[PDB]
């Protein structure tokens, strides 16, 4: 029975592992989203954004996916496009790593390398240009605003946490990129299962736009090394209404924490996994949370970060 | 309930995915062993070899693991040693990739870099030297001969295939490194579940020592690029008695096949996964196997091969 018709259907059912060298008496548990078809949390939204676009007729045989990304979402949409028979063009300029170019090329992406000077702005503008060229042939799935992003987390990630913890989860800590994870999970546990948990968004202290927004302060994004989070704006797919707390973490600490997960826990965590753990560790050691079960999303795996400051 | 006490307990429960561009009418299904704590099939034997050595008293608090390896088994034992609180020294010379040195160092391995000239021979000899230095402090777990290797495959991998296929599996195709996978799986399905499947070992045509042995021909190992299989000898953990067929695959075909799995199936397969699939595809297209369910082990994930001919 349990044979997936293609790799997209195999998303999720990722395990919870209790940490030994973080938290207090095992109150911190991590969900290993690296255990996915293309090795990140984004595999879930790659799958669901394609499936939803199919069900609503925005994606059909012959139409071609376009997206300005080279990160986890790009890899996720690439595997799904390959599995389901879509061409996909990802736009990212020329300054991207040879490794990622090779990985996406390996996955069969039509790579369009924009002007380096234009950076993310260049790549986005170029994605938009190709949709323009034939809007009935190209489709941008728009991870930052597409509801199919948080919805998959509400249907899979959140219920998996509920079931795996026998409903004992008290706190969910998740870094925010698109906001889909924390949103979907929070909706599931709070609204579908009815438990009043503490939802904790994590962002870089270098670019704490959620914290600034909620404090009514000037939004001042900044550069940081915590790949995957800290986009420098509030994404539409972050439901601020379900966020109970925002924890800020600095790049150095996130990196050191990822290294500790590897060397001390034997968990091959990515950089943003280090950020989420450091934030969860801080809450875990406040007496208010010490008899509470804290579940932390670890979005990606270490080997995706070999060229990075992680190593 | 489903919270693992450390990362070692989270091994296995890997998914089966049906291939669309290989076999005949979906008769080829792949088991994605890349979905494991340290991202390979070896995570299972890393876990079980440590657990068994604990239960039999050969591994205790304070004793230190030594092993001459830098591959998947090295990474598996590294994560388990980290998770369970053992020092581990891996011996491999100086000519190994910076990436792997960084990955194992990241996992907290005491790296001992032997003479390059001595290669695998050098590293093995050096491992043995350190055991000699204090045999009550050091332990070599010996993946090629330790029964805890095939046993974990008999208890987990094989039953998972049985359950996931509702006992319809007719053929298992697995490349042979230590031989533990094909051995354990075969024992489970044939002896524990009682079904007379066809067990198919896969080896490089460049180094077809199993085929030569069974034909009573001169054993002539040779170099090849199919990392993980083709050790150039018959390992003790290959139970030749349960092998029904041996299929040979060449390096180029294995590599092209891995690239096809990525680009055409959206499966991030490693090199030996390409070898196993090419062999399974050949059987799948013989009329004798065309109404048979073929299950193929995919031992590792693509990103572990970025520095290699795969890309």
Helix, strand counts (H, E) of chain B: 10, 11
Q: Given an 8 Å threshold on Cβ–Cβ distance, is A38 in contact with B5? A: no
Residue where one domain finishes, among candidates B111, B140, B169: B140
C-alpha closest to that of B73 among B105, B49, B97 = B49
Output the six-digit token pair for B181.
Answer: 């996978």
Q: Please indicate, yes or no, if residue A50 is contained in any of the structural domains.
A: no
The C-alpha R_g of chain A, in whole angstroms, comes to 19
Q: With an 8 Å Cβ cutoff, are A39 and B34 in contact?
A: yes
Sheet with A16-18: list strands edge to edge. Answer: A245-249, A198-204, A169-175, A293-298, A28-32, A16-18, B3-4
CA distance B99 to chain A (A): 7
Q: Is residue A311 part of a domain?
A: no
Angstroms from B8 CA to nearest CA on chain A = 8
Query: Do B158 and B35 fall within a single domain?
Result: yes
Q: Are residues A273 and A155 in the same domain?
A: yes
Nearest neighbour of B263 by CB, restricted to A38, A39, A108: A108
What is the DSSP secondary-structure string of B38-54? TSBTHHHHHHHHHHHHH
Query: CA B174 → CA A214, A239, A256, A282, B299, distances in Å?
Result: 55, 46, 39, 46, 9
Query: Residue A24 has which token pair?
Result: 């207090």
CA dihedral sign of residues B119, B122, B124, B126: negative
CA contacts within 13 A on the Cβ side of A37: 33
CA pair distance B269, A44, nearest whole angstrom: 19
SS3 content of chain A, % helix, strand, coil (to 5): 40, 20, 40
Of the candidates A202, A296, A298, A184, the one whose C-alpha atom is nearest the C-alpha of residue A242 is: A184
Residue B194 lies in a domain: yes
Give yes or no: residues B206 and B291 share one domain: yes
Distances (CA, A) of A36 to A161, A298, A305: 16, 12, 17
Same domain, A131 and A177: no
Residues on chain B touching A38 (C-beta within 8 angstroms): 266, 268
Q: Does residue B159 lie within any of the structural domains?
A: yes
Residue A124 belongs to a domain: yes
Compare all CA atoms of chain A with the CA of B46 and give the residue at the minimum distance.
A266
B187-193, Cβ contacts within 8 angstroms, sequence gap of 24 or more: B187/B150, B187/B154, B187/B158, B187/B239, B187/B242, B188/B153, B188/B154, B188/B155, B188/B157, B188/B158, B188/B159, B188/B161, B188/B162, B189/B158, B189/B161, B189/B162, B190/B242, B192/B154, B192/B158, B192/B159, B193/B158, B193/B159, B193/B162, B193/B167
Three-point CA angle B32, B203, B181, nearest 5°: 45
Does B291 lie in the same domain as B195?
Answer: yes
> Residue B28: enclosing H or E segment and its boundaries?
strand B28-32
Does B35 share its domain with B177?
yes
Same structural domain for residues B178 and B270? yes
Check whether B7 is labelled as a binding-site residue. Answer: yes
Helix boundaries (H) for chain B: 42-55, 72-84, 98-106, 119-133, 148-152, 158-164, 180-187, 209-215, 251-265, 271-284
Same domain, B20 and B95: no
Residues B23/B262, Cβ–Cβ less than 8 Å: no
Q: CA–CA separation, A275 vs A257, rounded Å?
A: 7
Helix (H, G, I), strand (E, B) or coil at A28: strand
The verdict on residue B200 lying in a domain is yes
Beta bridge partners of A3: B16
* CA proximity to A295, closest of B106, B3, B102: B3
Contact (Cβ atoms closer than 8 angstroms) between residue A175 and residue A276: yes
Is residue B289 within 8 A of residue B307, CB to CB? The reply is no
Same domain for A134 and A204:
no
The answer to the question of whether A122 is labelled as a binding residue is no
Shared domain check, B173 and B263: yes
Residues of A in contact with B47 (CB under 8 A): none
Resolution (A): 1.9
Helix (H) or strand (E) holding B25: none
Residue that finishes a domain, picked among B97, B117, B140: B140
Report in angstroms the alpha-carbon separations of A65 from A16, B10, B21, B254, B259: 33, 35, 21, 29, 21
CB–CB contacts below 8 A, A to B: 171
Strands (E), chain A: 3-4, 16-18, 28-32, 64-67, 88-93, 110-114, 138-140, 169-175, 198-204, 245-249, 293-298
**CA B150 from centroid of its chain's CA atoms:** 11
Q: Give me the residue label for tokens 């830098």.
A: B70
Scored b (16 or more CB within 10 A) or e, B247-262 reads bbbbbebbbebbbbbb
**Sign of torsion, CA B222 B227 B229 B232?**
positive
- Write the secondary structure of A100-150 as one string of H (helix), E (strand) and C (coil): HHHHHHHCCCEEEEECCCCHHHHHHHHHHHHHHHCCCCEEECCCCCCCHHH
From A39, A259, A264, residue closest to B301, measured CB to CB: A39
Structure tokens of B306?
């970025």
> What's the total number of domains in chain A?
2
Q: How far is Cα A34 from Cα A14, in angstroms, rounded to an integer? A: 8
Here the CATH number for the domain that contains residue A112 is 3.40.50.1100
- Cβ atoms of A295 and A189 within 8 Å: the answer is no
**How many angstroms separate the CA atoms of B17 and B15, rounded?**
6
CA distance A218 to A165: 39
For residue A47, tell me if it sits in a domain: no
Contact A229, A202 (CB under 8 A): yes
Q: What is residue A21's DSSP assignment?
A: S
B24 C-beta neighbours (distance < 10 Å), count: 16
- Tell me whether residue B181 is annotated as binding: yes
Give the residue numbers of A annotated as catalytic, written as ranges: 42, 272
- Please tell me whether residues A239 and A296 are part of one structural domain: yes
- The domain of A248 spans 7-40+146-305
Q: Establish if A46 belongs to a structural domain.
A: no
- Which contacts of B74-77 are long-range, i.e. CB under 8 A and separated by 24 or more positions? B74/B104, B74/B109, B75/B38, B75/B39, B75/B40, B75/B42, B75/B46, B75/B103, B75/B104, B75/B107, B76/B38, B76/B40, B76/B42, B76/B43, B76/B44, B76/B45, B76/B46, B76/B47, B77/B46, B77/B49, B77/B50, B77/B141
Cα distance between residue B48 and residue A9, in whole Å: 30
CB spacing of A81 vs B165 below 8 angstroms:
no
Q: Which residues contact A142 (CB under 8 A, 6 or more apart)?
A: none
Question: A302 is written with which tokens?
Answer: 């270490």
Query: Which residues touch A229 (CB under 8 Å, ≥6 apart)?
Result: A175, A176, A177, A202, A203, A204, A272, A275
- B272 part of the active site: yes
Cα torsion for A36, A41, A44, A49, to the nearest 10°?
Answer: -140
Query: Shortest Cα distance from A50 to chain B (angstroms)?
Result: 14
Q: Residues A189, A157: contact at Cβ < 8 Å?
A: no
- Cβ-nearest to A39 among B103, B265, B303: B303
Helix (H) or strand (E) holding B4: strand B3-4
A165 shares its domain with A269: yes
From B140, B163, B197, the end of a domain falls on: B140
Alpha helices in A222-286 (DSSP H): 251-265, 271-284
């Amino acid at each position: 029975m349990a044979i997936y018709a293609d790799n997209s259907y195999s998303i999720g059912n990722t395990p919870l592992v209790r940490l030994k060298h973080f938290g207090h008496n095992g109150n911190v548990v991590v969900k290993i989203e690296g255990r996915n078809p293309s090795y990140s949390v984004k595999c879930r939204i790659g799958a669901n954004m394609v499936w939803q676009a199919e069900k609503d007729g925005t994606l059909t045989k012959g139409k071609e996916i376009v997206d300005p990304t080279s990160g986890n979402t790009g890899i996720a949409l690439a595997y799904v496009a390959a599995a389901r028979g879509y061409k996909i063009t990802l736009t990212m300029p020329e300054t991207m790593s040879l490794e990622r170019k090779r990985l996406l090329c390996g996955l069969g992406v039509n790579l369009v390398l924009t002007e380096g000077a234009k950076g993310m702005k260049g790549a986005i503008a170029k994605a938009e240009e190709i949709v323009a060229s034939d809007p009935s042939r190209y489709v941008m799935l728009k991870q930052f605003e597409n509801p199919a992003n948080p919805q998959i987390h509400r249907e899979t990630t959140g219920p998996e946490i509920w079931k795996d913890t026998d409903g004992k989860v008290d706190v969910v800590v998740a870094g925010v990129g698109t906001g889909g994870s924390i949103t979907g999970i929070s909706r599931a546990i709070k609204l579908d299962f009815g438990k009043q948990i503490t939802s904790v968004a994590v962002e870089p202290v270098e670019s704490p736009v959620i914290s600034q927004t909620l404090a009514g302060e000037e939004v001042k994004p900044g550069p940081h090394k915590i790949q995957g989070i800290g986009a420098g704006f509030i994404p539409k797919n972050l439901d601020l209404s379900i966020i109970d707390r925002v924890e800020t973490v600095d790049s150095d600490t996130a990196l050191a924490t990822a290294r500790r997960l590897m060397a001390e826990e034997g968990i091959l965590a990515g950089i943003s996994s280090g950020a989420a753990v450091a934030a969860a560790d801080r809450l875990a050691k406040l007496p208010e949370f010490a008899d509470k079960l804290i579940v932390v999303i670890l979005p990606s795996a270490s080997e995706r970060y070999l060229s990075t400051a992680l190593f």
